[PDB]
Write a protein that binds this ligand. Sequence first.
Ligand SMILES: Nc1ncnc2c1ncn2[C@@H]1O[C@H](COP(=O)(O)OP(=O)(O)O)[C@@H](O)[C@H]1O
Ligand SMILES: [Mg+2]
Ligand SMILES: [Mg+2]
Length: 379
Amino acid sequence: LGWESLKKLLVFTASGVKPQGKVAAFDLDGTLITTRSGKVFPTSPSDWRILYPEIPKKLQELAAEGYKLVIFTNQMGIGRGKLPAEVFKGKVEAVLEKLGVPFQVLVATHAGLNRKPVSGMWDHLQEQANEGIPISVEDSVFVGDAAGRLANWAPGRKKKDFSCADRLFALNVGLPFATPEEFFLKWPAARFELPAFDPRTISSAGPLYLPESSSLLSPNPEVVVAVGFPGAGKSTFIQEHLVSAGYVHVNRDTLGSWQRCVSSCQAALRQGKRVVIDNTNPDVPSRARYIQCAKDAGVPCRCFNFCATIEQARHNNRFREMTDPSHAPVSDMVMFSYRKQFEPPTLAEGFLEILEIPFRLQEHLDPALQRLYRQFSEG
Ligand SMILES: Nc1ncnc2c1ncn2[C@@H]1O[C@H](COP(=O)(O)OP(=O)(O)O)[C@@H](O)[C@H]1O
Ligand SMILES: [Mg+2]
Ligand SMILES: [Mg+2]
């Protein structure tokens, strides 16, 4: 073999591979190879050819210069049961034979930590798969076609890149980056864009809530109704600021229905408690029930309106998926459904007051998780 099957990762190490202190790493599909058929997707495991004739010679030269040659490739078809692992393995081996140089190959079979642009595969190389030889990121390079290049970026290249995953993988790690044309053909740098949402720019600056004249807490019984996307940070915020103050946390996540949120709310008010309703509550009718509960109990009802944008929330959801196994994944469809349903909270509903909660960065207490949190996690 030379193949290893690990946790959501395949690693192949060709005979002849040596650990080195610098790496020249490459995406596979559309970077080293493309379809022989000229179709966008291969019509079978045999439907491949070396992308540019220049490739094998450049690779030999890189090996001669002391770079360990590495491939990082997303193949989530494997984890999804669409592409048998052994089939992909056979294709890899056929490609490597044609290329004619020793390679180590890492294959992210699933979503999550190992899937470019997240750095999981780089980290595995650095920590586990290089025989302890430290790798200099600055002396290394990553080459891939998923580079966020814009439409009509060169003569004969009308379509924009489908993805920016390769560029973002390099950005997350700190690797110098090039496209296959820039790298193998010495084309000038093409125009590109990164995703509009940049997790590096999320700031811990500014107020915890608005308006600053208001008070986050009430000394007396009340109902607080949270509003926000899944992934807006509702439960976390509540845990940090409200539960620590003695509020009863009514969490839809753990209660399994909104009906149980209602009954739990009524129960807590009956106990003379302060209560916060943790649910998405995008629509007027959902919120209306808790306002009514407040009324029945003769207590005020406030709204905490969590301002996280849909892309901030999706980023948080992907992060949660990578760090919190207990929790179930949130699809784009659930997110678009929230967006479809969303009606801004107003005082016309009967809230005593509405506080806006900006998405303020609160850094993760484990530095490895904080590092992860700062990574682009979507191509
Ligand atoms: N202010 C913040 N800064 C950084 N990460 C956050 C912040 N708030 C929440 N998160 C993270 O984002 C993810 C979603 O948070 P969570 O409280 O579960 O959102 P919700 O309850 O609205 O679904 C979690 O992984 C959490 O650790
Ligand atoms: Mg590619
Ligand atoms: Mg929650």
